Design a protein around this nucleic acid. Structure first.
Ligand SMILES: C[S@@+](CC[C@H](N)C(=O)[O-])C[C@H]1O[C@@H](n2cnc3c(N)ncnc32)[C@H](O)[C@@H]1O
Ligand SMILES: [Ca+2]
Ligand SMILES: [Ca+2]
Ligand SMILES: [Ca+2]
Ligand SMILES: [Ca+2]
Lengths: 504, 342, 143, 146
DNA sequence: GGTGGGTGGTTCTGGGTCCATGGGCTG
DNA sequence: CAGCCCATGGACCCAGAACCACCCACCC
DNA sequence: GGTGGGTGGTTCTGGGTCCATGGGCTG
DNA sequence: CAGCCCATGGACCCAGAACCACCCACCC
């Protein structure tokens, strides 16, 4: 911030007043401390005299380096002396091979940024504005590696059907077994009282595919293999997967799916910020259905909500909590539910909003989540726990997400006894904010499609007694999933609450 | 292979003879074939006309791009016309940003290898031998990502003792669990009566430390996550790991060792060949005992062997077998045992 | 025969994995090799992008041009992207004045052979024995 | 002093966690920060690397030189890499021509304060309470006139 | 404006001990 | 036989030692 | 030597349909 | 009550168009 820039200018004069020194060994200490304090904010750190190699090979020594958590450099700094001209020595140092990707050539009087061999900002120092601009741009430069994680995300967004074909073939050839065929008919029974009252054997096959597909990506792209060994839902499903994904078969499928997973895991390993890796979490969430089951993508209305809307919808509810009621999001009693959590962007951005002191109490028992599909549920849970690791500190299993049909949770969530009692504690809580993004689906394409939004008996009964009752409209389109979620939200809300939805 | 280049010498003339063309687009098919064919063996492949972007954000298209299994470019080819003076045209397309990593500027009568912004050689196209040498240099270039893997292997040797200290703390926290104490007696007694009659609980703790250290590395930098649930002794020491590798306890140890693993994890992700992983395997095999049990590392004399020593051995063994017993090394029936594997 | 036909498929599968691109620009290299080899093996060649001129005076450019020793043309190859209904792009090419003597209009999935002006045959390029049939016919169509 | 020393620790592990090196040049950034911050509130300032003269020599160069508001040197610090044995790096240093009027000889996990002609007390840097007591004396040492 | 001392990394390279521990006497 | 006598080669470190990189104080 | 023209790839940007399905009512 | 009328707004996608890179014939 510009505050830090002013602090540096006060240290620059202090060095030439207390020590009276004009040597590079002493006029640069000020900038060393400045970049160091800005860096600790971004997530990098400045490490001095890192001997690096040049284009010729000659060991060079940029006075500093913006090292990451995987010890990769996001940038460099070369402080010279106040007296020597910078533009001449910039071109003499560069000749020996000095870096040019993101180097801040400084001289205790003028700071230039040559980014990509290109002077972008020659801000003369001693500035109450654009010097802060310079450091912002430097600490927010895009590493050449992030633009490849972006390229690999798009390829996978388009070689997903070819990869899914492999997983599809596997599940068909497993139906030749009597251990698969026996356990996939018990999955169906437990899931004909929990999530889908019309759970088909082909819905159980879909869940199996998602579980395996995301398992390989969670242990490599995101490094978290222990998620599947802890998550109640995963365990109930490996019972069904380690019936065919075992020894030889397991190895065969994994080695056949490598010519697709490879590149993504070779660019997702060179980035080390989860917020950048969240772009793939979103991509997988949507693309999977469009490349496998678009019928599910229709009624569930799987879609991602741009962060700008979410962040607005969070700060606005905080600025309404003290207006009509009297509280602040980080208070005690602001129980924030979020039906329809999808990729989890409504609780990940809340973690980032909450301060780093009361966050513990809020993360533990005030943030709640609700999901119906498997891929979104898994993605959301992992995302929330990884955002907690990036914000607070030690990974702590989020124990408030559930797999229940929100509109039907009024023996719901019986897939795992854990999620059943997790949704029972959720039901018992005095919820106060109901934020979220409901599905806006209403009617099918053509009647040869055969895809009606599940009639929610309990919920549509109050719609008929409230919204539909007053509406004398000859046609009745108040049974939209968005209006059904609104009915559920108004009835969960007891008193003093702020329903915040974004819809048609 | 001068063999594969021998055919290039003819296909170049043949393509100008069986059809009187001299333009680059018509005569470049010969060099395409030569490059793509040599690559098939080396492990790479040549993907033609790759629209790789460059500095300043302009988009460029080399005639060919030698890519690997991780879609990571390892070398670029670019062909101009014979009339166009290669030397002058080289800098013309270097300004558009055409990579300077490993580009082969090739006219019909002359080729120029340019490694790290430096002309290595300028072989004439007539000699099959010179051309083969140039192409071998182009195929045996260590991309930036293997000098970075190599730097990290050195750091892992220095980070070994501190990573092992965290694993010792993990095994001591386990030694406080009664579930682990019981599981220990079963393993100590079993490994004693099955490997060497003087096994100790500390040897079992050391063996567990090896199991969990190799375990996390095998599930990421080696990505053979299944190995630990298919190998007999891996499942025999899986109970000794699970005892303290559960929920919060596992998380703590994994996150503590992550600061050491991260370096070699990323490095072995941008690598694909097993030969690079072999260097890290050798380092782990040695450094561990040097920084934990040097007493064991004298009774097991843990040291790795020179590759040239076993390469020459394998040559000699076949020639000797085929001069006294008249059998090939690959003749079904010759059983080969390796007592001290390492 | 069938060996070279299978080799073409292998090459194309490596292009869509080592590069990931399914664009013809990179995929054509596989069929270029197959056509060039069966040719040398049956006394011929596959000189590439040789500009032909049409009756209307259009400098057309087929992706291939099977030519023989006295420098005359015997066949022409034209590969289209694997991302278009082939029987549509065939018309567009021929409407520029593309040769109709013996032309292989080929997309990554289907290979259509035209001779004089009629579709002689269309094969799934995946079936080894079937392509082997169509390719042999193209290399044996004598004036 | 106690909260400040308890943050010099954090930025020590940070040099190795982010950079991945234990060479003296990079690990000296933590102690530099600590000393400068402590001196600021007290009034003084650690001006790093002020070439100081010698009895026998052309010139020497300490890596820390507490210089008061009136440009007068009243204390110093010479860092050490973990490789060297600190004790033998001390005699090597105080022989070339290094000052002894007030100098902190710190390695990375142990620190002595050779003050005005003799060592005071040797403290380990892992212990916050210990390093606190010693740095206080580096800062509460005043010449005899004062 | 050079230009060497002076601090620090860095990578070679030349060169070299006391003493375990079985067996054969052996009283 | 036990308790003395007699052999007889040994799965590496490391202290300089150049030597360079950066850079400040002194001759030019 | 430029240059327009063939071949192919890569971004933008503009621009818009019949028909599902619950209520309300004759009958 | 049960057929029989009467609404009423509906979570994208794909063809051109501009334009760009690369090389070839053809004016120069
Ligand atoms: C728009 S997405 C969630 C949006 C989320 N903010 C995001 O950015 O991904 C809608 C999600 O609601 C979930 N969902 C949960 N309960 C549901 C219910 N009762 N009916 C429909 N969808 C439900 C679906 O599984 C689906 O993934
Ligand atoms: Ca400098
Ligand atoms: Ca070319
Ligand atoms: Ca074509
Ligand atoms: Ca020092």
């Amino acid at each position: 911030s510009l505050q830090l820039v002013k602090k540096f200018q006060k240290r620059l004069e202090d060095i030439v007043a207390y020590g009276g020194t004009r040597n590079e060994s002493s006029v640069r200490a000020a900038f060393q401390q400045l970049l160091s304090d800005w860096a600790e904010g971004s997530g990098l750190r400045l490490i001095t005299e890192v001997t690096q190699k040049a284009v010729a090979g000659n060991n060079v020594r940029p006075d500093g380096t913006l090292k990451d958590s995987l010890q990769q450099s996001r940038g460099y700094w070369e402080s010279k002396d106040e007296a020597d001209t910078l533009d001449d020595e910039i071109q003499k140092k560069l000749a020996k091979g000095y870096p040019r990707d993101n180097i801040i050539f400084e001289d205790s009087r003028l700071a230039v940024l040559m980014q990509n061999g290109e002077e972008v900002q020659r801000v003369d120092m001693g500035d109450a504005g654009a010097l802060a601009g310079l450091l912002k741009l430097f600490f927010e430069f895009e590493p050449p590696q992030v633009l490849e994680f972006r390229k690999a995300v798009d390829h996978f967004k388009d070689e997903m059907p070819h990869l899914l074909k492999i997983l599809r073939e596997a599940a068909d050839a497993a139906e030749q077994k009597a251990d698969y065929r026996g356990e996939r008919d018990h999955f169906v029974e437990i899931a004909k009282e929990a999530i889908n009252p019309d759970f088909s054997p082909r819905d159980a096959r879909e869940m199996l595919i998602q579980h395996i597909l995301t398992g390989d990506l969670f242990t490599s792209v995101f490094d978290n293999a222990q998620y599947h060994e802890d998550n109640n839902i995963a365990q109930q499903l490996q019972q069904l997967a380690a019936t065919f994904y075992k020894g030889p078969v397991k190895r065969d499928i994994a080695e056949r799916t490598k010519r697709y997973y490879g590149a993504i895991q070779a660019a997702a390993a060179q980035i080390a910020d989860h917020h950048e890796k969240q772009r793939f979490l979103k991509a997988l969430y949507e693309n999977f259905y469009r490349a496998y089951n678009p019928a599910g993508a229709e009624r569930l209305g799987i879609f991602y909500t741009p962060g700008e809307i979410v962040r607005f919808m969070i700060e606005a509810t905080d600025t309404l909590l003290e207006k009509h009621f009297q509280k602040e999001l980080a208070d005690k009693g602001v129980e924030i539910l979020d039906p329809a959590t999808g990729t989890g962007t409504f609780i990940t951005e809340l973690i980032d909003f909450l301060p780093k002191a009361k966050l513990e109490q809020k993360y533990r028992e005030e943030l709640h989540c609700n999901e119906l599909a498997l891929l979104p549920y898994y993605i959301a849970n992992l995302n929330i726990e990884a955002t907690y690791a990036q914000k607070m500190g030690r990974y702590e299993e989020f124990r408030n997400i559930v797999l229940v049909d929100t509109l039907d949770n009024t023996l719901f969530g019986s897939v795992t006894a854990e999620n059943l009692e997790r949704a029972k504690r959720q039901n018992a809580r005095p919820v106060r904010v109901i934020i979220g993004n409901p599905p806006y689906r209403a009617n099918q394409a053509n009647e040869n499609d055969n895809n009606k939004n599940r009639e929610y008996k309990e919920i549509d009964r109050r719609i008929k007694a409230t919204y539909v009752a007053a509406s004398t409209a000859q046609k009745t389109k108040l049974y939209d999933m968005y209006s059904r979620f609104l009915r559920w939200a108004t009835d969960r809300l007891k008193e003093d609450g702020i329903v915040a939805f974004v819809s048609n």
